[PDB]
Amino acid sequence: GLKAAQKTLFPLRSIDDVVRLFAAELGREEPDLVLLSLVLGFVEHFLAVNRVIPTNVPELTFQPSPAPDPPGGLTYFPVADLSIIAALYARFTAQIRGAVDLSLYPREGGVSSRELVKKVSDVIWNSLSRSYFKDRAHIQSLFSFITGTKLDSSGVAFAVVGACQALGLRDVHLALSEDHAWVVFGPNGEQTAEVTWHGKGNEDRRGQTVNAGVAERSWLYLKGSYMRCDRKMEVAFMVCAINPSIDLHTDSLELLQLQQKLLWLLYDLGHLERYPMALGNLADLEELEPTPGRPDPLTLYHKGIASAKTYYRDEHIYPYMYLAGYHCRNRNVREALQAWADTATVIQDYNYCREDEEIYKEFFEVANDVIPNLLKEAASLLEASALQDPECFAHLLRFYDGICKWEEGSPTPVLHVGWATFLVQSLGRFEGQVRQKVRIVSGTVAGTARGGPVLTFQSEKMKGMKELLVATKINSSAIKLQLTAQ
Amino acid sequence: GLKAAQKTLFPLRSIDDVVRLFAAELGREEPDLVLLSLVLGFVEHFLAVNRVIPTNVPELTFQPSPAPDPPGGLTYFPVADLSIIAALYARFTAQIRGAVDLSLYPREGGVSSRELVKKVSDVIWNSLSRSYFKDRAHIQSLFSFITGTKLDSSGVAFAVVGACQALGLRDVHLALSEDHAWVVFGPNGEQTAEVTWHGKGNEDRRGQTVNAGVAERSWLYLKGSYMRCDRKMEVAFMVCAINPSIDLHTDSLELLQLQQKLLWLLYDLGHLERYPMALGNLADLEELEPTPGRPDPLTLYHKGIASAKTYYRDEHIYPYMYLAGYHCRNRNVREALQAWADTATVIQDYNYCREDEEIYKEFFEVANDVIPNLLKEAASLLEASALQDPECFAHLLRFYDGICKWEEGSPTPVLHVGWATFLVQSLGRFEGQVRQKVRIVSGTVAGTARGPEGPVLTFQSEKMKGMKELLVATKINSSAIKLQLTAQSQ
Ligand SMILES: COc1cc(-c2ccc(CN[C@H]3C[C@@H](O)[C@@H](N(C)c4ncnc5sc(CC(F)(F)F)cc45)C3)cc2)nnc1OC
Ligand SMILES: COc1cc(-c2ccc(CN[C@H]3C[C@@H](O)[C@@H](N(C)c4ncnc5sc(CC(F)(F)F)cc45)C3)cc2)nnc1OC
Numbered sequence A: 001g002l003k004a005a006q007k008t009l010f011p012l013r014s015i016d017d018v019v020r021l022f023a024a025e026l027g028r029e030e031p032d033l034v035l036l037s038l039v040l041g042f043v044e045h046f047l048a049v050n051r052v053i054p055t056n057v058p059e060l061t062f063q064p065s066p067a068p069d070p071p072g073g074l075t076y077f078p079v080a081d082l083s084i085i086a087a088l089y090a091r092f093t094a095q096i097r098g099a100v101d102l103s104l105y106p107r108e109g110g111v112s113s114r115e116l117v118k119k120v121s122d123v124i125w126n127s128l129s130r131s132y133f134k135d136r137a138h139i140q141s142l143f144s145f146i147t148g149t150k151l152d153s154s155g156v157a158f159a160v161v162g163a164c165q166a167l168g169l170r171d172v173h174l175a176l177s178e179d180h181a182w183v184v185f186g187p188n189g190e191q192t193a194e195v196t197w198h199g200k201g202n203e204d205r206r207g208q209t210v211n212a213g214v215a216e217r218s219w220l221y222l223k224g225s226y227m228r229c230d231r232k233m234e235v236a237f238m239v240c241a242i243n244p245s246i247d248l249h250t251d252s253l254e255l256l257q258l259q260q261k262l263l264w265l266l267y268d269l270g271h272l273e274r275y276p277m278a279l280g281n282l283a284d285l286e287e288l289e290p291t292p293g294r295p296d297p298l299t300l301y302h303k304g305i306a307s308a309k310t311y312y313r314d315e316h317i318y319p320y321m322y323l324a325g326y327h328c329r330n331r332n333v334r335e336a337l338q339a340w341a342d343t344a345t346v347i348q349d350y351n352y353c354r355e356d357e358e359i360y361k362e363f364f365e366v367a368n369d370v371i372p373n374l375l376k377e378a379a380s381l382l383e384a385s386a387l388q389d390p391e392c393f394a395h396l397l398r399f400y401d402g403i404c405k406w407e408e409g410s411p412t413p414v415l416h417v418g419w420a421t422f423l424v425q426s427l428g429r430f431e432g433q434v435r436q437k438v439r440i441v442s443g444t445v446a447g448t449a450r451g452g453p454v455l456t457f458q459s460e461k462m463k464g465m466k467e468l469l470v471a472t473k474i475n476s477s478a479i480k481l482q483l484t485a486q
Numbered sequence B: 001g002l003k004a005a006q007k008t009l010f011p012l013r014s015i016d017d018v019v020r021l022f023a024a025e026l027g028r029e030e031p032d033l034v035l036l037s038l039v040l041g042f043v044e045h046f047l048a049v050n051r052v053i054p055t056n057v058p059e060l061t062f063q064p065s066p067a068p069d070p071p072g073g074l075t076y077f078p079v080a081d082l083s084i085i086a087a088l089y090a091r092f093t094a095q096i097r098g099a100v101d102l103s104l105y106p107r108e109g110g111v112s113s114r115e116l117v118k119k120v121s122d123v124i125w126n127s128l129s130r131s132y133f134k135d136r137a138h139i140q141s142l143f144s145f146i147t148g149t150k151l152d153s154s155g156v157a158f159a160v161v162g163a164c165q166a167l168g169l170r171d172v173h174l175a176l177s178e179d180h181a182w183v184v185f186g187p188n189g190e191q192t193a194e195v196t197w198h199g200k201g202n203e204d205r206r207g208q209t210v211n212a213g214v215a216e217r218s219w220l221y222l223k224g225s226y227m228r229c230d231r232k233m234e235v236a237f238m239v240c241a242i243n244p245s246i247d248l249h250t251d252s253l254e255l256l257q258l259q260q261k262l263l264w265l266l267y268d269l270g271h272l273e274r275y276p277m278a279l280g281n282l283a284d285l286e287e288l289e290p291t292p293g294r295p296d297p298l299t300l301y302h303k304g305i306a307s308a309k310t311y312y313r314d315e316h317i318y319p320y321m322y323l324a325g326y327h328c329r330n331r332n333v334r335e336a337l338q339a340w341a342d343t344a345t346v347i348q349d350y351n352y353c354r355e356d357e358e359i360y361k362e363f364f365e366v367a368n369d370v371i372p373n374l375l376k377e378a379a380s381l382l383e384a385s386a387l388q389d390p391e392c393f394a395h396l397l398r399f400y401d402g403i404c405k406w407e408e409g410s411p412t413p414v415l416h417v418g419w420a421t422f423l424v425q426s427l428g429r430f431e432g433q434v435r436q437k438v439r440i441v442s443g444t445v446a447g448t449a450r451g452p453e454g455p456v457l458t459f460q461s462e463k464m465k466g467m468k469e470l471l472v473a474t475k476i477n478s479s480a481i482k483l484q485l486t487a488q489s490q
Helices: A015-027 A033-049 A082-099 A114-126 A142-148 A153-166 A211-215 A231-240 A253-268 A276-288 A297-311 A318-329 A333-347 A354-382 A390-407 A417-427 A460-464 A478-483 B015-026 B033-049 B082-099 B114-125 B142-147 B153-166 B211-215 B231-240 B253-268 B276-288 B297-312 B318-330 B333-347 B354-383 B390-407 B417-427 B432-436 B468-472 B478-485
Strands: A062-066 A074-078 A173-176 A181-185 A191-193 A245-247 B061-063 B077-079 B173-176 B181-185 B191-193
Touching: A015 A033, A015 A231, A015 A253, A033 A074, A033 A082, A033 A142, A033 A153, A033 A231, A033 A253, A074 A253, A082 A114, A082 A142, A082 A153, A114 A153, A114 A181, A114 A191, A142 A153, A153 A173, A153 A181, A153 A231, A173 A231, A231 A253, A231 A276, A253 A276, A276 A297, A276 A318, A297 A318, A318 A333, A318 A354, A333 A354, A333 A390, A354 A390, A354 A417, A390 A417, A390 A460, A417 A478, A460 A478, B015 B033, B015 B231, B015 B253, B033 B077, B033 B082, B033 B142, B033 B153, B033 B231, B033 B253, B082 B114, B082 B142, B082 B153, B114 B153, B114 B181, B114 B191, B142 B153, B153 B173, B153 B181, B153 B231, B173 B231, B231 B253, B231 B276, B253 B276, B276 B297, B276 B318, B297 B318, B318 B333, B318 B354, B333 B354, B333 B390, B354 B390, B354 B417, B390 B417, B390 B432, B417 B478, B432 B468, B468 B478
Parallel strands: none
Antiparallel strands: A062 A074, A173 A181, A181 A191, B061 B077, B173 B181, B181 B191
8 A cells, every 4th residue: 555655766776766765765754664675675685685687587586787987887776666565565464454453452642562573573574585694695674575585683772673664653663772673652651661672583582572671771772771763763773674785795886876865865854963872883884885065984984973862862882883983994093092992981881691792892902903003003104103192002001991891790701811912911001101181080179169081980999909010110010900800 | 380190189178188198298219398388387377277167258268067075066277278278389489580690600410509498487487577586486487478478487488498408409308406407408407507597696507517606515406416407307397387376375275287188197107207396296185186096196206316316416305305294194103203303404415605595495494393292292192192102303414414514614604593482392392201211422442343222313513513412402402402503713
């Protein structure tokens, strides 16, 4: 059941055609989530999944056009014919409206019961292939759901939202952590239910609320400061969900261009206002292919951080990682270290759980790979300056401080001997003359009155080893002992 | 143009009439594939595709007869009229002979060249419509090809083989994997051609030889132990290709019966002797409505395995699954677990490629659904016996060993979190008393020399070996097993 105002835009023969359909849909009060996902799903299938052009399928044709130099030549876009898309579309709605009898669910006050939402969730759930590998690229879109009955984790969430729209339930919306997804609904929008699995397979929590996740201060639930989406933001989600990767080292430039354009569309309508990750994703895309007259990536990264601070109580980690990354790839060592410090400064007030494995890996790689490497490549510059700058030393101490504070209160230790080496290796990359320029205090007087670097640890472990750090001989044994504990 | 010897059999007013026509055809040096496919297409059409008796239709007539009880009533069969079939038949042979000019290609010795076969394939390729975004039933037949141009993947191959018979090329024959189809020609039959696609997202190997697939030890090519049909088997193939699915939960009781009789007919003429799936197919049918004075289902599954061993080096998977299935349905836990274990043993010697996703799903459903069911429905029969027979436990370990072994040396991993839980759940289904009764030896001395016990089992896979002790322990180290069942030197 498409509206005639939707069909009038088909067939879509190019990137711009798709962008146009998105602008159309964002215009309406409730953009058709299922329609937009199908389209992106259809387009991604031929641009990344199966690029071999069929020539004996009815309704399937390819649209030639100039490709950008260097390459030059032609590029072939999959023509999204109405007949294919509409048929896919009707298969989804048929499946949904047939399996869910709203009559059985006394939906009063324009508010969806918890039982209704569990039901819809279960429909989508029981529809999936039992066998597939769940960590596979390109099973995010409803195209993939209807075609292959394969959905990735956050896909299931998105699909359950899309089902609810198709059922006329305008009160069920997609909630997004920085690494998980569920559903919110209810009068105030204050009711939650899990609908998908997280991590390695654990589909356990389906149906329950997210109260316990928020309470245990895990990064997965962002202490409550997760994203609650509106329809417009759900479109932003699926645009971010576009996966341009063909293989491990190869990207479809059409999918890159298209995701980039859709984000600017969204950006301009201001729908990335409360979406730090989107803004960062947009910035990442601008460093690759900078579209002219648009803000520089740096500006975008900052918009992301601003957003997190205004709307998410500055409880998001990735906005700083996004920025850190930039300064690493541009060799801005001082700024690069600062951002990593800022990142750690956020994680400090969280408690590390098993569910949080993803950010752990990210922090682990920062501490034990990105930072050590960064310093080496900077010591290669001198022996032929950041290493002379005690700010950078203070940044590095602040980074570890965050990590130690993070650990405090956690039901699982963070730091082990793996970290010990690299701390020492990294520490021993700053002349003892430089390290000593950093005063590590408590502060003597609170506040102010109208009438080298300084630094203050917040963690036990780090303030416990206040001196070992500024000494001229790195006591490479007492540090490793103290960084680790029980 | 039909021969005179064939027309005298129309009109086909019933199943038995269709049988008779088949008998006739099966008694020649070349049974007409095109004639028999068309007839089958036709009958399946009005029997599953569109069961509504046309009001506007002139030449289509329907024959009633008594229906099987309990339901009862009368069952109306679509009369295959000579005019219609001849028409369709003329249409096809016309279309094909129209597109190929046999003189363009020098065919010396009665041997067909690669070019000729490429073309005949191309002619079928650019005539059909592929149903890319859906799986369409009832589009296997040439009947479908002419009517709708719709043709599924293996339907293409069969179409090239029929089109070649229509051009009177008696050398081009049908190659049959367990989940693919291609074409064999050439002097001895050692010429291989790809004519169709496989699944979705796989590249395009049309025109090439299946050498690479044999090489890479993928199940799609059976390491070489695939079927090369003779005409008689190609007929058996299209009989298997009969498709009684009306919808997803409803079967055409008349198409079942037609197929069951056609297989028994092919069986008696000895045309199923080198076709394990056909023998499996028939057996499943005999489980449903057993025909009297015939072999038991059990007997037929074995003949399928037997066949597999004889002609195909025991490199086939389905023949075991066919047996396993029957056992599960009879709740013969012991045989079922065994049959599954044998299935794994065969597979152990394969590598796993993307194109094999079909046998994957199938193993997965065994590991993570079927076996678990069996054992859970058994813990109940005890509380109210196999779950304390260490034989069974051994079967279960051999199973897993094969899958692990399968995975070894594959481009893609095979095991993931999804499997981990049910392994553990199934290990726990046997008391540690029983699981310890099983001894897992590597072997100390090679071979023997001239001048009681419980189950003994040797693992072939590094994965199962490295976790031999964890399996027999009384405390099932749930966590450690799961960890080790997964691995990545990738
Ligand atoms: C460890 O070393 C380094 C790390 C980083 C770095 C830089 C940026 C990031 C953030 N990565 C983005 C990529 C993108 O997929 C973002 N994700 C997960 C999302 N983007 C947009 N919307 C969403 S919604 C969501 C939750 C879900 F998936 F729905 F459940 C997740 C999500 C996360 C992570 C790491 N950069 N540089 C490094 O070294 C130089
Ligand atoms: C996984 O759990 C269970 C599985 C099974 C089971 C039982 C039987 C099978 C084999 N299925 C048959 C059905 C039938 O279509 C057979 N097919 C594919 C063919 N039959 C005959 N000829 C051919 S030729 C061919 C390849 C092609 F199509 F030509 F390209 C395929 C093919 C295969 C597979 C699994 N049975 N029971 C189970 O639990 C009880």
